[PDB]
Design a protein around this ligand. Structure first.
Ligand SMILES: [Mg+2]
Ligand SMILES: [Mg+2]
Ligand SMILES: [Mg+2]
Ligand SMILES: [Mg+2]
Ligand SMILES: [Mg+2]
Ligand SMILES: [Mg+2]
Ligand SMILES: [Mg+2]
Ligand SMILES: [Mg+2]
Ligand SMILES: [Mg+2]
Ligand SMILES: [Mg+2]
Ligand SMILES: [Mg+2]
Ligand SMILES: [Mg+2]
Lengths: 121, 67, 230, 247
RNA sequence: AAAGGCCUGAUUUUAUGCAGGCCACCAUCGAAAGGGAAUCCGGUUAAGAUUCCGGAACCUGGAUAUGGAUUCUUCACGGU
RNA sequence: UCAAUGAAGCGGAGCUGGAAUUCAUUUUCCACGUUCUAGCAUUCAAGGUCCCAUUCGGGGCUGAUCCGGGUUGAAGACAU
């Protein structure tokens, strides 16, 4: 009779094969479409007098955006919907529960012309 | 069959043979968990006459209870 | 060599932190390993009533090899051969139709505990092999007595797995020959004689002797030192 | 009518030990092969105060015998043990203050401390400041050692139980009067919520068996049977005698 | 209690499986006054700012060449 | 039933040293690498021996006696 040598007095659970799931059927079988596309991210512009004076003074577009949108998604949506390059995004949750995004554009883009192209002012 | 011998033998609980088996087994069960799956009935004749079948979907558990 | 020397380390107490050593003796095993080892231990520590420990008197290697050689000549039909002879029977029913006799009479090992016990009670069995490691042992513990009562030669033999492999099962727990062919009648008779000299002819004495009561290594050492000392 | 003060303590809510500042349990080394067969050398790295404990503690560093690393220990410093001193703990250790020896391998009249009640329990006897155990006899067959405990009782310990040569340091502490409630306050702030104590007679009958009456008095004997039940055992429990100790 | 994750370098049908290494730890919740990576000044509003604007910094996680340093006494030299 | 430990060195037998004024008789026991010193002690260990076909390296044994896989101590049919 032979016996194996054990340097440790502790027995550990041996490593056995862990198979990846190979399901017989799909879990839902229709993937959900994008829950946050650019249209869902950007709800509408904000057109108060303060937001507008920010538009022609700070190169800033003020938007009401989805409460589920983070600064990355807001940056990506603005670039896609309006084809402007974004310098910075500041966000806040307004006292009415909506989210406001201050989206400052680069020096290469104006905020007046974009606001005009979108439609307000 | 053998189930008739098992049924008669199980009734002799205080014979030498069943007393030995009883002591060894009661130690074994105490070492295991309070509730644990049994791989098979230790009393095949008793399980049968209660309605156990040796087929997929019949399960035996072992449980101990404080007296 | 001028560049290699002898370090030798001092693996004594207080010096040279110990080297790796075989610690298998001190391994803390999982409880199921513990329970099966200590189950084997406790079953030989206690006194074993003769009805048990008549078992673990097992057919020794040479006549076990002989017995299983004779038995392997009478293996039951597998699924393949059974359906092949089913086709042969269908072919006869198509063309011959004697009565139902395309296939010839079979000579197969009988197995199944209920089947074998009834075979013994009817005195049809000519050799019975009992597995020595059935759990619960109640299923076979009466078999040597029944075989002795009914005049049926029996052998307690190592391996329900070994019995099972000659009947295409994982475990048979019992095997029996009720009849053989002429070419094996002499081999059956000589093996029955040796098996009787080993099991049935010792039954009256074996029934009187208790097993177990064996000590562990350390207790046995400390007993024989006090036997010598005082 | 109400659960009395000594009964509430067992619920262990506000009466637990104040353990935040403590250095860790004071223990000998776990009884290993080295100290069963030979001895092992440690170094006294610190002598440190321990909150709630009168005696100082010695942090002694030993090398692990089985892997390259240092294991630290929290001994109760015996008097005369200094930092940088080498401790030797084993069957073959020398009879010097601070060393840890089996009881069977020290002569008659040896003064030890932190004695094991059972071999391997890592010290149970003579642990408070100034206390010590005297080895008063050996019984080599079925090896036992007769000892004298700090309370005066005669104990029979296995000769393989261990102890530290010398007396627990910090002795003479209770010789100094506290002089004032505030010093008792700070002493027990580090121990547990046993202080101050209200006298049972000062209470009401709902609060204590001593309570009530138009004078402060006990009214029945203060000596209580050992078999009295919780809520009754307030006084002098199972007293064999009372009164000023004067034969 | 059989409670487990960390590198290999390979390999350049190559994904990261795959032969050695290491490890003895073992949930999680618990502080907007405890511990803790890193920001300031000036200006600006009706109402915001160490958060916006201008200027000037810093930290962290990434990637990444150049210069410099070292290097045929290979892994710097000086100072008792 | 109690306690501990990352269940690491338990039990038995050896070997060697040693007192034994041991007879070739473990019938004997003993001891089994560490004590001036706040250093250091880890890389399957260097060395010895053997082999691979050895590809810079790898594997054996030994170093580090053998055997029983009862982790070890307490306690015990009492206690619980
Ligand atoms: Mg699944
Ligand atoms: Mg926010
Ligand atoms: Mg914010
Ligand atoms: Mg009450
Ligand atoms: Mg506590
Ligand atoms: Mg008072
Ligand atoms: Mg009052
Ligand atoms: Mg009352
Ligand atoms: Mg938290
Ligand atoms: Mg603090
Ligand atoms: Mg500012
Ligand atoms: Mg303000």
């Amino acid at each position: 009779k032979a016996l194996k040598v054990r340097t440790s007095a502790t027995f550990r659970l041996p490593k056995t094969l862990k198979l990846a799931r190979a399901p017989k059927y799909a879990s839902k079988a229709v993937p959900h479409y994008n829950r946050l596309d650019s249209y869902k991210v950007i709800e509408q512009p904000i057109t108060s007098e303060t937001a507008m004076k920010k538009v022609e003074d700070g190169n800033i577009l003020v938007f009401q955006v989805s409460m589920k949108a983070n600064k990355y998604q807001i940056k990506k949506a603005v670039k896609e919907l309006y084809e402007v390059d974004v310098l910075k995004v500041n966000t806040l949750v307004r006292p009415n529960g909506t989210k406001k995004a201050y989206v400052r554009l680069t020096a290469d883009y104006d905020a007046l012309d974009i606001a005009n192209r979108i439609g307000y002012i | 069959g053998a189930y008739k011998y098992l049924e008669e033998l199980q009734r002799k609980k205080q014979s030498d043979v069943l007393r030995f088996l009883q002591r060894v087994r009661v130690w074994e069960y105490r070492q295991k968990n309070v509730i644990h799956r049994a791989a098979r009935p230790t009393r095949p004749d008793k399980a049968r006459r209660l309605g156990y079948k040796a087929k997929q979907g019949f399960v035996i558990y072992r449980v101990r209870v404080r007296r | 060599n001028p560049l290699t020397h002898s370090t030798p380390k001092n693996f004594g107490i207080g010096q040279a932190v110990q080297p790796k050593r075989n610690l298998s003796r001190y391994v803390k095993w999982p409880e199921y390993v513990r329970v099966q080892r200590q189950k084997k231990i406790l079953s030989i520590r206690l006194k074993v009533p003769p009805t048990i420990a008549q078992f673990q008197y097992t057919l020794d290697r040479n006549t076990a090899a002989e017995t299983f050689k004779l038995f392997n000549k009478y293996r039951p039909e597998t699924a393949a051969e059974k359906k092949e002879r089913l086709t042969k029977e269908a072919a006869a029913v198509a063309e011959g139709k004697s009565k139902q006799d395309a296939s010839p009479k079979p000579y197969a090992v009988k197995y199944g505990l209920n089947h074998v016990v009834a075979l013994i009670e009817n005195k049809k069995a000519k050799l019975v092999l009992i597995a020595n490691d059935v759990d619960p042992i109640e299923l076979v513990v009466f078999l040597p007595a029944l075989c002795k009562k009914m005049g049926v030669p029996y052998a307690i033999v190592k391996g329900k797995a070994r019995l099972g492999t000659l009947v295409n099962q994982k475990t048979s727990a019992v095997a029996a020959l009720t009849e053989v062919r002429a070419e094996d009648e002499a081999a059956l008779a000589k093996l029955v004689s040796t098996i009787d000299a080993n099991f049935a002819d010792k039954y009256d004495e074996v029934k009187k002797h208790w097993g177990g009561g064996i000590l562990g290594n350390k207790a046995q050492a400390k007993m024989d030192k006090r036997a010598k000392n005082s | 009518g109400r659960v009395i003060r000594n009964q509430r303590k067992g619920a262990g809510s506000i009466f637990t030990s104040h353990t935040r500042l403590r250095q860790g349990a004071a223990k000998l080394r776990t009884l290993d092969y080295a100290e069963r067969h030979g001895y092992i050398r440690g170094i006294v790295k610190q002598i440190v105060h321990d909150s709630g404990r009168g005696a100082p503690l010695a942090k002694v560093v030993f090398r692990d015998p089985y892997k390259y690393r240092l294991r630290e220990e929290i001994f109760i410093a015996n008097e005369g043990v200094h930092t940088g001193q080498f401790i030797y703990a084993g069957k073959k250790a020398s009879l010097n203050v601070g060393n840890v020896l089996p009881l069977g391998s020290v002569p008659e009249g040896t003064i030890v401390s932190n004695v094991e009640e059972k071999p391997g329990d890592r010290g149970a006897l003579a642990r408070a400041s100034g206390n010590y155990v005297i080895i008063i006899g050996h019984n080599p067959d079925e090896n036992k050692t007769r000892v004298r405990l700090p309370s005066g009782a005669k104990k029979v310990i296995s000769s393989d139980a261990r102890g530290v040569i010398g007396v627990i340091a910090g002795g003479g502490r209770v010789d100094k009067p506290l002089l004032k409630a505030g010093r008792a306050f700070h002493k027990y702030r580090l121990k547990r919520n046993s202080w101050p104590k209200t006298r049972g007679v000062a209470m009401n009958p709902v609060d204590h068996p001593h309570g009530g009456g138009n004078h402060q008095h006990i009214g029945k004997a203060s000596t209580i049977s050992r078999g009295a039940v919780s809520g009754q055992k307030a006084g002098l429990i199972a007293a064999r005698r009372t009164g000023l100790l004067r034969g």
